[PDB]
Amino acid sequence: HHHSQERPTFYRQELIWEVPERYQNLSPVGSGAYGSVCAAFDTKTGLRVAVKKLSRPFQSIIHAKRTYRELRLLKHMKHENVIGLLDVFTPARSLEEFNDVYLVTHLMGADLNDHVQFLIYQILRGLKYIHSADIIHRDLKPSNLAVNEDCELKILDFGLARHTDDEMTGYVATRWYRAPEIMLNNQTVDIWSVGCIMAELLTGRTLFPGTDHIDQLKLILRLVGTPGAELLKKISSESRNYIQSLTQMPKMNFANVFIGANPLAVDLLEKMLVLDSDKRITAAQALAHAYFAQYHDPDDEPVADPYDQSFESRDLLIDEWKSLTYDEVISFVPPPL
Template sequence: MKHENVIGILDVFTPDITLEKFNDFYLVMPFMGTDLSKIMKHEKLTEDRIQFLVYQMLKGLKYIHSSGIIHRDLKPGNLAVNEDCELKILDFGLARHTDSEMTGYVVTRWYRAPEVILNWMHYTQTDLDQLTEIMKITGTPTQDFVQKLQSQDAKNYIKSLPKVQKKDFASILKYANPLAVNLLEKMLVLDAEKRITAAEALMHPYFEPIHDPEEEIEAEKYDDTFDNMDLPLDEWKRITYKEILNFNPPQTSESKETAV
């Protein structure tokens, strides 16, 4: 990942001088200072800062998604922010190449996407409560949406729910910027196929004052050569060691975020 709004690697190294002794390695990443979760606990964000933070988040997501990768655990604690309000998406421990087997178990509950819950077979009461809360706002889904679900349990569950109409977002968010409300309404659509994409969201009028198409870049396709290889542990160790020795740190001018 090489994008200003996605965490990158500045360096990777090992203190072990031979393959036989190779046991540890270290990843060096930009120093960011804090995350959005901590900021939100301590201060009320202004409209300008919200707009700038969400814009950066979407730029990072457009880049990630264009490479065929989804994050799955996007939440305030995984959005690093520095003192200049510059944002980077962190923690790709749960990221994976897009497929239909997204498991819901590991994702932080309140930020779990509805499609992650619905594609996960092992429901708990908490997950069903979470879906019910989501549908109080989005309304219960259409028959088209239900047919697309892979899990029969999910289909049965949704069919059992009382029909709920979609809420008017403007009546819930009475004091918010109308453009922000309009954007949220397009983002919080239950059917992922009908939901606004990160790339489309960047072109929404809400971001018109700060929109810069040259910064909204796409990624090269993710190289998944090694993803499904079944190799012995020693071979993985050899490949990893070689990768570390061949790593070329990016040529960047030293800044306050890297000079720690």
């Protein structure tokens, strides 16, 4: 139980959104099987916002756990370079009516598809924090990075679509950013994604635009070379055979792929796009790279509070996922304005 369940504030428009009256000028910006997002203006704060209506949130156990997972995640994220919950709400007046979940954050200028140094810095700073609470993103791409007027950035995950091999969001494949260990076979799988993003920011074009999985690898290997002895041993799936059988190609001079770029940037990209994930540079290491010397401050790059995700192992009924989420909705307190 919550104030709003006594305050007749909810109105209804089809776009079928029931939201408090503080939230006006709703405007669709994206949709999928898992929910919808509108921009809107909040008359209470005076600022512009986004709102996600989860779709049929307690209809299946997938949706139900997923709903709870996202809300728990966003309620924990308190970092400038990570999406933060401004509000969570439901038209429900009690648990018996609790059927829809709505989350509210800042609307940041647009998204992404010395400004590159600043953006990348911000991405890694947010990634250090995500990774420190033992969350891997898994789907970093330009459309999951929101930016404002001042090139001030926030990592997010729209999460509207079912994750599939051939997934698409606008005119971009998800596989273009996939760490090749996933595609084929640690937390640095996000770092692979970061490096492909930084390449795109420097050149204006996609680093690895594969048609399909074999094309993608050939394009990756074209850039960074075929694997050495050590990486091959660590690949546990015998069919290892396939990449070992590939004619050895030499890594390119990254300097002449990224013509004119800061030498430091090119050096950082090399340390990001290493095939062997035990040797790829981590978010915390990469912030201390000299490329960011004008932004780096280790003490203003915090890690997260311990994140209790013991729920991930639990086999719960839908209604327990629902009732666990209800508590989280009803106890949500907005961040200090």
